[PDB]
């Protein structure tokens, strides 16, 4: 059934699984028209499909051309997400196919179940976790590839860089969710924490800076402080 | 007018005949039901006074044979049986009628209720849903499961309703996932009507039979099938105008007949709210919507 805090270790067992987050598939700017009405303009989006054990990210870029002359775009976006996840599963060799797909939003369940009828043994599950995957577009190199796309494209990343050489996948996932939660809560302050020190850079083949183990402890503490500081401002507490 | 004589009534029982019901006392001199209208299927149904568990009964058509009821003290139920000897049967019925030991099917001349509930129901279609080919009549009870219920366990005692499953490869053409899930017209018109039922009459016959088994036996699987066949039409953007007009009549008479005090167990809130207020056909069921709003406004 639904994935929660009771079954958190399940994310890092040896059964292949993917998280699917559709938050950034359909993205718009809202603006005034010359007549003083309001209009939307779509910008490029992405499906965020992540193996939480390996860090493998299947970033399907959704180019604005897929919306052209379509109606009910917020509904279509869920079905287009399910279509592309189904296509990704069919493209993988059998031994690489997931045994479970966890959707971050319950509105993805029926569209994904219907697209995956051919895969009755792949479980489609919701989660009770509030995961900050919407903040993916705050990771500069992911934002850059989405915005530059001139056509539909799939780009493969490891969202953990080389962290799994030093830490477990449980710890890597905890670090990722803390970074993404901080970027979601106060993007400018989170990016300042990550990039302020110019002597620590991001390798060409990485997404995050090349922090030592002790520097990651400092960064993680500064991210927790940012989240608490922001919670104190929201609620005046 | 045809007759279903009873050997005796050895146990206290409520007897149903179609939408009517009569209480019979233990060892009361009751010997059956006369003046049953020719031209319709009928159902004769039972609920024992000393154990309201298992409602059960028999679908039959007096045009297809001479039927009578006899209590079986081993199996503890009233059984329908066929009498092949015409002259014996006529002689028993004549004797019981002369002694006025039979109740009369109490049809008001103005009253089209039973026709309106069974318009599309035919015995040959009942006998394909309820498989017992050695009898011309069909036994149904409260506990019998459907083929679809058994998929999710004795197959010989099952209701073989047509399986309807909105999240099945039968309902969804590869490549038309969103189209077929949001608009069930393909599934209704090509798969079900053209493919399985052959015509709207057979589809409505099964829908009407499902409703009657739900109402008369409290058969849960029958209730599921009735709602699934309503929802499949209401969820289709493309339905022939004659089918919508007829569905409105069919449902109106079903909602009219339903006991008021059974609405909480016989009516699915989600399906009815969807069909009347959200679906493609939300504006196509005027008669049904008016009776539902006036009789069961709490469900909505």
From Swiss-Prot, chain A:
Effect recorded for residue 22 to N: Reduced growth at 30 degrees Celsius. Strongly reduced growth at 16 degrees Celsius
Cellular location(s): Nucleus
Effect after changing residue 105 to K: Severely impaired growth. Reduced growth at 30 degrees Celsius. Strongly reduced growth at 16 degrees Celsius
Ranges for region RNase H homology domain: 7-237
Assembly behavior: Component of the U4/U6-U5 tri-snRNP complex composed of the U4, U6 and U5 snRNAs and at least PRP3, PRP4, PRP6, PRP8, PRP18, PRP31, PRP38, SNU13, SNU23, SNU66, SNU114, SPP381, SMB1, SMD1, SMD2, SMD3, SMX2, SMX3, LSM2, LSM3, LSM4, LSM5, LSM6, LSM7, LSM8, BRR2 and DIB1.
Domain notes: The MPN (JAB/Mov34) domain has structural similarity with deubiquitinating enzymes, but lacks the residues that would bind the catalytic metal ion. Contains a region with structural similarity to reverse transcriptase, presenting the classical thumb, fingers and palm architecture, but lacks enzyme activity, since the essential metal-binding residues are not conserved.
Record's function text: Functions as a scaffold that mediates the ordered assembly of spliceosomal proteins and snRNAs. Required for association of BRR2 with the spliceosomal U5 snRNP, and the subsequent assembly of the U4/U6-U5 tri-snRNP complex. Functions as a scaffold that positions spliceosomal U2, U5 and U6 snRNAs at splice sites on pre-mRNA substrates, so that splicing can occur. Interacts with both the 5' and the 3' splice site, as well as the branch region. Has a role in branch site-3' splice site selection. Associates with the branch site-3' splice 3'-exon region. Also has a role in cell cycle.
Miscellaneous comment text of the record: Present with 468 molecules/cell in log phase SD medium.
Protein name: Pre-mRNA-splicing factor 8
Species in which this protein is naturally found: Saccharomyces cerevisiae (strain ATCC 204508 / S288c) (Baker's yeast)
Shown segment, full-protein numbering: 1836 to 2069 of 2413
Curated annotation (Swiss-Prot), chain B:
Subcellular location, record wording: Cytoplasm; Nucleus
CDD domains per record: Aar2_C (cd13778), Aar2_N (cd13777)
GO CC terms in record: cytoplasm; U5 snRNP
Pfam families (UniProt xref): AAR2, AAR2_1st
Keyword Cytoplasm among record annotations: yes
Subunit and interaction comment: Heterodimer. Interacts with PRP8 (via RNase H homology domain and MPN domain), competing with BRR2 for the same binding site. Component of a U5 snRNP complex that contains at least the U5 snRNA, PRP8, SNU114, AAR2, SMB1, SMD1, SMD2, SMD3, SME1, SMX2 and SMX3, but is not a component of the U4/U6-U5 tri-snRNP complex.
Miscellaneous information on this protein: Present with 7330 molecules/cell in log phase SD medium.
Similarity comment: Belongs to the AAR2 family.
Stored PANTHER family: A1 CISTRON SPLICING FACTOR AAR2-RELATED, PROTEIN AAR2 HOMOLOG
Record protein name field: A1 cistron-splicing factor AAR2
Lineage of the organism: Eukaryota, Fungi, Dikarya, Ascomycota, Saccharomycotina
Gene name of the encoded protein: AAR2
């Amino acid at each position: 059934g639904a994935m929660n805090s009771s079954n958190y270790a399940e994310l890092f067992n040896n059964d292949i699984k993917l998280f699917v987050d559709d938050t950034n598939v359909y993205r718009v700017t809202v603006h005034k028209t010359f007549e003083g009405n309001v209009a939307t303009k779509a910008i490029n989006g992405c499906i965020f499909t992540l193996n939480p054990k390996t860090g493998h990210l299947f970033l399907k870029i959704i180019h604005t051309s897929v919306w052209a002359g379509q109606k009910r775009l917020s509904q279509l976006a869920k079905w287009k997400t399910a279509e592309e996840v189904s296509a990704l599963v069919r493209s993988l060799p059998k031994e690489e196919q997931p045994k479970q797909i966890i959707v971050t939003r319950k509105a993805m369940l029926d569209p994904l179940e219907v697209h995956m009828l051919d895969f009755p043994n792949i479980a489609i599950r919701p989660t009770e976790l509030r995961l900050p995957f919407s903040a993916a577009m705050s990771i500069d190199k992911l934002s850059d590839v989405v915005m530059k796309a001139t056509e539909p494209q799939m780009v493969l990343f490891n969202i953990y860089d080389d962290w799994l050489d030093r830490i477990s996948s449980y710890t890597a996932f905890s670090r990722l969710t803390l970074l993404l939660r901080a970027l979601k809560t106060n993007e400018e302050s989170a990016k300042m924490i990550l990039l302020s020190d110019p002597t620590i850079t991001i390798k060409s083949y990485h997404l995050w800076p090349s922090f030592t183990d002790e520097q990651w402890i400092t960064i993680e503490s500064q991210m927790r402080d940012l989240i608490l500081t922001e919670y104190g401002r929201k609620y005046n507490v | 007018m045809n007759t279903v004589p009873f050997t005796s009534a050895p146990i206290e029982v409520t007897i149903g005949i179609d939408q009517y019901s009569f209480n019979v006392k233990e060892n009361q001199p009751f010997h059956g039901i006369k003046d049953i209208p020719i031209g319709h299927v009928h159902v004769i149904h039972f609920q024992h006074a000393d154990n309201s568990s298992m409602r059960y009964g028999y679908w039959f058509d007096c045009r297809m044979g001479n039927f009578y009821i006899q209590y079986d003290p081993k199996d503890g139920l009233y059984k329908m049986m066929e009498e092949r000897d015409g002259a014996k049967f006529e002689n028993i019925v004549h004797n019981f009628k002369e002694r006025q030991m039979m109740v009369s099917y109490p049809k008001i001349d103005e009253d089209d209720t039973w026709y309106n509930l069974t318009e599309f129901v035919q015995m040959d279609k009942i006998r394909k849903i309820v498989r017992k080919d050695e009898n011309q009549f069909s036994y149904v009870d409260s506990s019998m499961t459907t083929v679809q219920e058994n998929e999710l366990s004795d197959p010989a005692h099952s209701l073989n309703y047509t399986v309807i499953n909105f999240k099945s490869r039968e309902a969804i053409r590869p490549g038309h996932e969103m189209e077929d899930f949001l608009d069930k017209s393909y599934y209704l018109n090509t798969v079900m009507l053209q493919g399985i039922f052959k015509n709207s009459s057979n589809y409505f016959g099964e829908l009407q039979f499902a409703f009657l088994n739900a109402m008369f036996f409290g058969n849960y699987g029958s209730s599921l099938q009735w709602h699934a066949m309503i929802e499949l039409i209401c969820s289709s953007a493309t339905v022939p105008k004659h089918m919508l007009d007829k569905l409105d009549e069919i449902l109106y008479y079903q909602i009219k007949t339903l006991p008021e005090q059974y609405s909480d167990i016989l009516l699915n809130e989600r399906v009815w709210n969807i069909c009347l207020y959200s679906s493609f056909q939300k504006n196509s069921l005027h008669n049904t919507e008016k009776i539902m709003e006036n009789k069961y406004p709490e469900l909505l």
